[PDB]
Amino acid sequence: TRKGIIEGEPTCCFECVECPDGEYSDETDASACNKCPDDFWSNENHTSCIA
Amino acid sequence: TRKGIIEGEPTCCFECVECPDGEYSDETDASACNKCPDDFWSNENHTSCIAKEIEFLSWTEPFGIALTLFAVLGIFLTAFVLGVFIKFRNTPIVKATNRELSYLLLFSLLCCFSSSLFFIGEPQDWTCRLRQPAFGISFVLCISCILVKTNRVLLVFEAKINLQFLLVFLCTFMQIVICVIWLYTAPPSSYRNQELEDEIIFITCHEGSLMALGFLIGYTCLLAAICFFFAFKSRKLPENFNEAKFITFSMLIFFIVWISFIPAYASTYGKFVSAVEVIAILAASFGLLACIFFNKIYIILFKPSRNTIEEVR
Amino acid sequence: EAKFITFSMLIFFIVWISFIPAYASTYGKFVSAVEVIAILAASFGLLACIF
Ligand SMILES: CCCCCCCC/C=C\CCCCCCCC(=O)O[C@H](COC(=O)CCCCCCCCCCCCCCC)COP(=O)(O)OC[C@H](O)CO
Ligand SMILES: CC(C)CCC[C@@H](C)[C@H]1CC[C@H]2[C@@H]3CC=C4C[C@@H](OC(=O)CCC(=O)O)CC[C@]4(C)[C@H]3CC[C@]12C
Ligand SMILES: COc1cccc([C@@H](C)NCCCc2ccccc2Cl)c1
Ligand SMILES: [Ca+2]
Ligand SMILES: [Ca+2]
């Protein structure tokens, strides 16, 4: 999951938004979902890449 | 495009990230992209919601055009043969081939060629409910007439006991009983499909109970097998210009088509599934027609000098 | 040998015509599968009809 802006609040306050299909986020507090390289796709938990 | 967070910088300092495929966004400086509701999909620009593509085998698609053309050709041929027999209702061939059941058989062939047309277009509830029972009843009628014409079937039937109309009534009535139980217990209905591809919609019929369809198909195949067995037993008799040999040929064609049906149905994915159905129907129907009538047609219209009781032997 | 040649060709045509929707609506292993089946069917028909 990535961090989403809550309008009208500082940077500290955010929301958790699940990454879209084919995108992974291994690290906690990620500001951008990561694109799997070619020949790889996202998991069911959208954490890492599976060939 | 939505707003992403640049870490370590204030909220005024943001990044522009394009919406994913499925969600859209129109308002400027949007925080998160908006999910697009059902029956709707997002365009490439992810700015609005366009309608999903509803697709099915249609009357205007070229494949459906060809299917309709062949079905109509079959109907025309059946009507031609029926008219030829009706006009010659007293010539020796028509009298010997029991013109009443020939009229009934041509009627059922018309019904089969017509039921071939319920698989084209957008499926509705009545269409789905009529699809299978119509073909089942019509083809059981055809096979029952053929089975009556076959030699030694009638003698065996009366020994186990017009009687021929009783036979055709029994067969068709058993099929109608199956169809009525099917339509009463768990009728089929149309179904919209969105899990094949996320962007398009498939209207496919959903058969209520597969057990009833299995019963229908099995009974039709059983009748065909009985007819083939008896025709093979009497396959050398030159009666009716070797009618039993051509009955055998028609049954072989039927079985060949409906055995080829299984891999073709299994491998087909999408709308063309219904396609396969129609093709199978047509082939079987056409075979019947030819194997039962064209020879007789050729002896009557062209070279009509063999239309004598002696050669009917 | 008339009705044997006729039936071999009939099997050939029926097999190759019933698979048109599958060839027009399939990708990957299955399409190749279809080809093999068609081939085998035609071949068998020929043999079973002729010899
Ligand atoms: C998915 C399916 C697609 C396929 C579509 C096909 C669907 C339609 C099926 C069948 C129709 C007719 C089939 C009937 C087959 C029966 C033909 C047959 O076996 O007859 C033999 C000889 O006949 C003969 O002259 C044989 C003459 C051969 C003529 C048959 C041609 C069939 C053409 C149809 C093609 C249309 C496709 C259209 C697709 C767009 C028997 O003789 P015999 O040795 O006992 O002694 C007799 C001798 O005279 C005495 O010495
Ligand atoms: C319209 C399409 C999709 C299928 C319908 C079949 C037709 C193509 C017709 C036209 C030519 C017909 C054939 C023309 C001649 C004969 C000869 C006839 O020969 C015999 O074996 C009988 C003995 C004799 O004729 O001496 C058998 C039927 C058959 C094959 C007919 C069966 C039906 C056929 C194949
Ligand atoms: C073989 O004799 C028949 C008797 C009744 C119907 C038919 C044809 C017109 N449909 C086959 C039904 C095909 C089928 C098989 C399994 C699951 C769903 C479906 Cl749809 C043939
Ligand atoms: Ca504030
Ligand atoms: Ca700073």
DSSP codes, B206-220:
E-S-HHHHHHHHHHH
Ligand 3 touching residue B246 (CB < 6 A): no
| Contacts of B240 by beta carbon, 8 Å cutoff, 6+ apart | B96, B97, B312
Q: Are B6 and B13 in contact (CB under 8 A)?
A: yes
Report the C-alpha gap between B230 and B244 in whole angstroms. 9
Q: Which two tokens stand for residue A13?
A: 């306050």
Å from CA of B253 to ligand 1 middle: 10
Tokens 């699940």 sit on residue: A18
What's chain A's Rg over C-alpha atoms?
12
Tokens 């299984």 sit on residue: B262
Report the C-alpha gap between C18 and C25 in whole angstroms. 13
Helices (H), B268-301: 272-289, 295-300
Report the C-alpha gap between C36 and C51 in whole angstroms. 22
Q: In this structure, how many other beta carbons lie within 10 angstroms of the beta carbon of residue B62?
A: 8
**Is C25–B256 a contact, with Cβ atoms under 8 angstroms apart?**
no
Q: Which two tokens stand for residue B297?
A: 């047609």
Please report the resolution in angstroms.
3.8
Based on the number of CB atoms within 10 Å of its own CB, is C27 exposed (0-12), middle (13-18) or buried (19 or more)?
A: exposed
Length of chain B: 313
Angle at B178 between CA B177 and CA B183, to 5 degrees: 95
Find the helix packing angle between B272-289 and B243-267, rounded to 10°: 180
Chains in touch with A (3+ beta-carbon pairs under 8 Å) read: B
**Is C22–B280 a contact, with Cβ atoms under 8 angstroms apart?**
no
B139-174 exposure pattern, b = at least 16 Cβ within 10 A, e = fewer: bbbbbbbbbbbbbebbeebeeeeeebeebbeebbee
Q: Phi, psi (5° rounding) for residue B49?
A: -125, 120
Binding residues of A: 8
Residue B281, CA atoms < 13 Å, CB-side half-sphere:
30
Helix, strand or coil for residue B124? coil
**Is B276–C18 a contact, with Cβ atoms under 8 angstroms apart?**
yes
With CA atoms as reference, the chain B residue closest to A23 would be: B20
Chains in touch with C (3+ beta-carbon pairs under 8 Å) read: B
Q: Phi, psi (5° rounding) for residue B3?
A: -100, 125
Helix, strand or coil for residue B191? strand
Q: Are B19 and B33 in contact (CB under 8 A)?
A: yes
Q: Phi, psi (5° rounding) for residue C41?
A: -55, -55
Please tell me the experimental approach by which this structure was elucidated. cryo-EM
